[PDB]
Design a protein around this ligand. Sequence first.
Ligand SMILES: *[C@](O)([C@H](C)CO)[C@H](CC(C)C)NC(=O)[C@H](Cc1ccccc1)NC(=O)[C@H](CC(C)C)NC(=O)[C@H](CCc1ccccc1)NC(=O)CN1CCOCC1
Ligand SMILES: CC(C)C[C@H](NC(=O)[C@H](CCc1ccccc1)NC(=O)CN1CCOCC1)C(=O)N[C@@H](Cc1ccccc1)C(=O)N[C@@H](CC(C)C)[C@@H](O)[C@H](C)CO
Lengths: 238, 204, 220, 234, 202, 245, 244, 233
Amino acid sequence: NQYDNDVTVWSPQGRIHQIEYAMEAVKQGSATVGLKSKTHAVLVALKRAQSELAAHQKKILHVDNHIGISIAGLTADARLLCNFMRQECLDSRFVFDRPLPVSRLVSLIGSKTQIPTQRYGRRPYGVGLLIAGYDDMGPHIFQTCPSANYFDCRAMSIGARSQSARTYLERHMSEFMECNLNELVKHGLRALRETLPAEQDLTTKNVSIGIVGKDLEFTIYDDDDVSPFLEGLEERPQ
Amino acid sequence: SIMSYNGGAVMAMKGKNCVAIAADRRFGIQAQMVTTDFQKIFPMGDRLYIGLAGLATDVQTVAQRLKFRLNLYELKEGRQIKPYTLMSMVANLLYEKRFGPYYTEPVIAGLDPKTFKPFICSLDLIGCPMVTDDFVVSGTCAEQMYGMCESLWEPNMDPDHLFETISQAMLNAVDRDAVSGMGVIVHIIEKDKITTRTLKARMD
Amino acid sequence: TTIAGVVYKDGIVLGADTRATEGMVVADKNCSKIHFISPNIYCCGAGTAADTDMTTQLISSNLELHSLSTGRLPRVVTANRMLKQMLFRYQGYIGAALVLGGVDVTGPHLYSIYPHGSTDKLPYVTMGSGSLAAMAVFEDKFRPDMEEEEAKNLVSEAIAAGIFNDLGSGSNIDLCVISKNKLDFLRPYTVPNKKGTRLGRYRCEKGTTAVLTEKITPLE
Amino acid sequence: YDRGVNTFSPEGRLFQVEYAIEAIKLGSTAIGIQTSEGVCLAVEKRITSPLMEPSSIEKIVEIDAHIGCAMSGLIADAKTLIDKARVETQNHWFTYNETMTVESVTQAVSNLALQFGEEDADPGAMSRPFGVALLFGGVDEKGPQLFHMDPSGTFVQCDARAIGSASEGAQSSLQEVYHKSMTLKEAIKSSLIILKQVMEEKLNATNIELATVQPGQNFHMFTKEELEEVIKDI
Amino acid sequence: TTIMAVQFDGGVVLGADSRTTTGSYIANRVTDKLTPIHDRIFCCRSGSAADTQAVADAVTYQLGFHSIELNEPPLVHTAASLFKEMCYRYREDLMAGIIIAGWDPQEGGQVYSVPMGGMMVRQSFAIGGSGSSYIYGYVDATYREGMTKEECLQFTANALALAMERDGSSGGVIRLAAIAESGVERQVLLGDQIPKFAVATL
Amino acid sequence: SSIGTGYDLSASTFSPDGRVFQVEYAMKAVENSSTAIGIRCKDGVVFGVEKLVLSKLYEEGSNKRLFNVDRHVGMAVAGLLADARSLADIAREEASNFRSNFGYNIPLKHLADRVAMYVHAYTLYSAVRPFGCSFMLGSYSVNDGAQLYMIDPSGVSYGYWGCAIGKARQAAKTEIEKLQMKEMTCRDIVKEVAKIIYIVHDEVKDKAFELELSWVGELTNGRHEIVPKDIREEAEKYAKESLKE
Amino acid sequence: SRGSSAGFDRHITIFSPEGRLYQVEYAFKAINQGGLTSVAVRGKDCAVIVTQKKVPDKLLDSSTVTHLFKITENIGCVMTGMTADSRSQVQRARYEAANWKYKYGYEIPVDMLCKRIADISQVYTQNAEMRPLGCCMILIGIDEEQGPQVYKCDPAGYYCGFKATAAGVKQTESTSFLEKKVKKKFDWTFEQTVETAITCLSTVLSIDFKPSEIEVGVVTVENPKFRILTEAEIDAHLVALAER
Amino acid sequence: AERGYSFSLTTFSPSGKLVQIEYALAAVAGGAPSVGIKAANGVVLATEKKQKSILYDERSVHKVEPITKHIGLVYSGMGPDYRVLVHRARKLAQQYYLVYQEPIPTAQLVQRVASVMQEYTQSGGVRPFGVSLLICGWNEGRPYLFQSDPSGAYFAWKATAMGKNYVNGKTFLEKRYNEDLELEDAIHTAILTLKESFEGQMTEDNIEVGICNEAGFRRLTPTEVKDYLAAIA
Ligand SMILES: *[C@](O)([C@H](C)CO)[C@H](CC(C)C)NC(=O)[C@H](Cc1ccccc1)NC(=O)[C@H](CC(C)C)NC(=O)[C@H](CCc1ccccc1)NC(=O)CN1CCOCC1
Ligand SMILES: CC(C)C[C@H](NC(=O)[C@H](CCc1ccccc1)NC(=O)CN1CCOCC1)C(=O)N[C@@H](Cc1ccccc1)C(=O)N[C@@H](CC(C)C)[C@@H](O)[C@H](C)CO
């Protein structure tokens, strides 16, 4: 209780409680899935709604022509980090006239987000990110945490009840690398839908898709443009 | 020249146990006279006067800031200021603007408030002090004033001979300069009293 | 001005004239150009008067602080470093040519310091508008390890050359002798120039000056 | 026990922000309804004295000729946000020679969300979140639009939304009467009805304020007479 | 001025004139232009006296602290690099032509030039200063690889003598320094010691 | 060895027995991390890291605990990873600045000194908290030699022949002591490193793990490089086989 | 009073009711945490430093384990206490020395160096944002006229010149030894000084060192450069002691 | 990275007491005793310079410090704080001299140093000085003795004492001393009032004395102290 309120205070057990509390912010948001084939990187996000009269929250954001993200946590921090990534990409294009390698952008995210976890009066970024990108090393799915740690993934899921999605993806990793785009998005949608009780399922009103690849810039499908993906899926079990 | 813009003349002379300080009264802009009663001599306390010649603005400004620092000095310390001390004060004040100097050449004349020992000095525009035992001059007609002072000044002058000497020096120097004159004022200061006179002078 | 400095067997002799000019007119007939730095270090100043004054004063002050903290007698190299570094930081905008002389725990030391911040450690140096004449006297009549009076004679001779040959120099000759255990700050070491005596009486008798206004004010 | 203004709860939320959300619940309730014929914003004034001039209580203001805003909570905090919005719209007009989309304005204001803190900050920087909630109703190229924003900075589009003390009840009553095809008159009527329900004082022409933004007409604040003519058909 | 530095096997040889002028007047006919930066690292100064002195002081400071912090004899290339950094950074405010030379346990005898540009280059031998112009030809026709220490000594002596004879800004006395693992052997050639050459008569 | 009545909430506050508990807590954060070892042979330095795998979803080579600080200097980290990465940035920048100022590759002892000073700068104020990681810097040169240094959260820097940091620090040190690295070569050493990693690893409490390996020596022209897949799989085979005795 | 406390006077550098600074004293206790002891002895023509070299691991390049530091070619030092803080203070000392020579044109006196370091420590003593350093510094070197100098500075800001001192765990015992040995008035030669130091440490720890268990810094009038003794020339003194 | 605490560490208690200043005074009344005596033709400062071993070199650090050529200092309390205040005082004096080209009046130096000490009772993130200062000087013919305590307050003294047993020393001076004394007599009664708390054989190295007449300020040599400490001369 005395080691809870500052990010500059180590616990006697070698832990920083503010960082972990910040990590808990990711689980507060709606779940999201990211997976890559060998040609495409795909983000599938479950949009959440307050009431039935409120539109669904944006979960997928455009960063650069070759990079997009899916957020999970505080939308303000998400917008901040997003603008940062956008700025870094623009800088890279301005200086070198070539798109910024995704891994380097992720490294910069790590460096930036690490700073406030070591200064008094500062706080960690209350947001988790799934980054889908394509460069001359192929497609990439990355994950960034409030603890400023980042991971290079074959597949990943973060947020509320994302454990189900994780469990699903962990079985189909081997399938992922050879799937075509439609099958990849399918797998993503199944993983995403696993994080739901049987009384509810995916809809064109509550599902967003972000796709980037060797033949496609990062694009966001939101409403009627999602139907070609949903229509072509199993009935799921109970 | 910037100094010659307003013109003017300031002189100080030493006496027995008295001291003298004089200055012309013309405030003019280049060739036109605006005022005939312009003050160029300011009292920095009892029996201690300063006289500034040069650019009128800097005359007034240096006088005012000097009075500022002086008042603060005589408040912080429970005493009147010594002549040497005032000189160093002015020197510091002027040198603070070493690379953007006030265009005025101050001349200090007074008596030691503790003793009575006469004191005259002059300074640069950047505040280099110069103490003398006879006379000090500053102004557009410095050469004329030097000419008169080098030939009129005697050592131990009484408060009456000192007056006549500094008056003749000022009058006759100023009368050979076009931008100095329109009246001369003389302060002859001694331990007991201060006598202020304005001389009969040319007004052309 | 016309300042010089020499190093002899027991210490250092510093010389300077006393003429200060503004324009081509003598403003000060008796100006002290040999400045106190530390009780064992003195410095002659030539160039912009106020600059030499404030610079020498500042360095003197800093050296007083220095020795106050160290408890020892100040070294000449220290004054030299302070001076040259300050002067160099201002890139010559401080018109201060200097002759720095003093006796240390390491012996006698003489430096010349130019306003741009360069220094020269030499057995004899000259600075000022009359420095060439003085340097001629030095180059003609200097020998290593001179006796005190001999060196005083040499330096005063140099300053004299500056005085009579340079229109920028004039009036008295000031000396400063500094040995391992003596400090002779001889003010008017020589008055080789005298004003001619007045041949007339131009004294104005009381009343010859007409007055328009009078006001007496009593003091205390 | 005191802590920093950027401290996280074990649940994963910022204390100050949550407390600001709690602060909203004490404010005047306001309702915004989106309709293909235009957007409407209504709010109770909560006059605490007969001596208080009710025309000096504005909880509905004009961001720009095509955008209006309704606010609930600590109004003094809202003034700053309003001015920032106006300035943003005008800057955008200056730079691009066009009007701002309602979403862009809402986002711009939402960027001032968690712009508070103690150490490592500017001298004039905010010390605490804004204890206010906003409804942005306006007409752009995407037609009529209504947005909602809370101290968290999370902003989202709504077809119909109620903020303030009577938030929940008014929201239920809104859900009961909203279909994505109402006429603007129906929206105004419903708004005033729910308002009359939730208000403790008798709803009249000087008790509330109503404003509409429609594709053909600029931001319009309803005058006393017009208010009466809508209250008429109670 | 006129400086010079030649590299032999086990070290280097430095040489300079001693004339320091302001205008056409000689403010110091006996300057010491070879300045010690470290135990076995020297530099030859040309250009503004104030500038070169200040820079030399600063580099001595920095290199001293650096060598203490590393607890190793400083590389000559490092001193040359400090000089290079200073002279390049403030190239528009400095008038300095430097020749940094000395001995170093890792690379032996080294000679580097830092001309007014701020560039840096290692050379078998280097000349600088106003007088250097008059000895480019001689130094080109006389240099031979594999010179002994004494051969380099005589070499710089002759070159400097010629330059001083021709250049008005150069003259006075010849200062030489021999740097090797052994240490620093400084000497001064004056009067009849300075090499003389046959002047045309009839 | 356990006081905490307000005396353990800051690095600007000493304990009544003269201790800075924040630093020690950070060290405990280092202790809770997976073990990373590094050993110096006569012809270079080899690094080995027990990189625990938290999920099969993660790509191979993710969360590298082996960094390239300079072209001649490698870095092995243990503990809070973000801090370790930031420290890697600081080390890199220090080496870069040294090159840009002095004109040659930074000596390892100096780099370690500088970075260590930077680390120590965080063990003194309440405005910042000590770094939660320990690390090892390895390098080789012909004029310098083979060198291996280590820095803990307090800012202490030391030169080692063999070193380990993490959970089984002592358990690894006892295994390193058995080796005669003063005579062996980095080629032979890799196998022994992998071996000690597999020995020290606890297959029960901790789940699956990936092994990271790093060269820096005469066999690599002084360049710090990753161990080729061939030699790595060879060393892993040797380790898995040596685990059956 | 007599142990009283109020407010945060035990957490930061503010006054206790009896006018004490608890954080400073705690720093003095932090000096002992290293578990080592250093001894400094001033001779007639030299100055000697000796310190434990506890190297409990064969995995350590024993050449990197040192508490002796060269501040300047003619100024040496030994640090006792928290290692990192010690290295910090050594860096600062080196800076202040180099800067001194740069500004004033002569080598800094040990007196002035120690005074400066102590003056820097005083700030930590008076400001609450930082905490004093858990280390003690002992400087040695030859002064141009005052000859051999051995100074010492505390975390409290206290600095002083000494004929002999010690620091660390067995400080008081070592001082009680040294003053007893000083009162006897011997011919303080080089070997006398070194032997007195080594035997002080030895009879204070009851160990009888191997030549690899201690390290010895030294500075002579005939050779003012700070010199660190090899294992061999330490073993020379060691075997020189076991004869009388 | 570092900045600083911007808030006062010295605040008013409900009773109205600036507690940290009082604790600072508690630190002052705990250090070695120091006496100061103004004596018509000069001033005397004296202090207990009792080390704590034969190993200490008493000829390296001094308690009686000169500020300028005419002003001297002794103290009661903490050494380091005193050292800081000495440096600062010297600097202030040099500033005054640079501006006015006249040696700083003792009262002025006292006031300025007092302002400096006052700062640390209000400025952020700092404690007051645990030091009381006795400042002697010779300005404008008359001799001067001043005291400044941690609060930044200052008083003019004919004679006084600080440190351990400052009350007994104050009554002692109040009785066994008065005006019209010469410098010699003052030194005598100063070493005498210092002896009223010297629990040991008071040697010439156990105490330190500085004098300030109209010929400047200086520290008395151990020899002169030996001559005085012979209970005569
Ligand atoms: C060398 O290069 C050879 C001999 C050829 O020049 C020597 C050796 C060095 C290492 C000392 N260099 C000089 O002799 C050198 C030339 C120089 C002139 C100007 C700028 C930079 C270099 N002489 C000096 O540096 C000399 C130093 C002392 C006075 C001995 N000072 C100057 O030359 C004055 C530079 C100041 C300056 C003037 C104008 C604008 C900016 C800076 N030059 C003067 O004219 C000084 N002064 C005023 C005019 O009448 C004579 C006195
Ligand atoms: C009359 C005395 C009290 C001082 C005299 N002051 C002055 O001459 C000052 C100069 C102020 C200045 C401003 C900016 C930059 C530089 C200087 N002038 C004024 O005060 C008034 N004027 C303003 C406009 O009309 C001309 C002068 C002076 O400095 N004289 C120098 C010569 C000088 C050099 C460069 C610039 C200005 C003057 C001097 O005596 N120097 C001697 C050395 C001493 C004084 C240490 C010598 O060098 C010998 C006498 C040769 O001059």
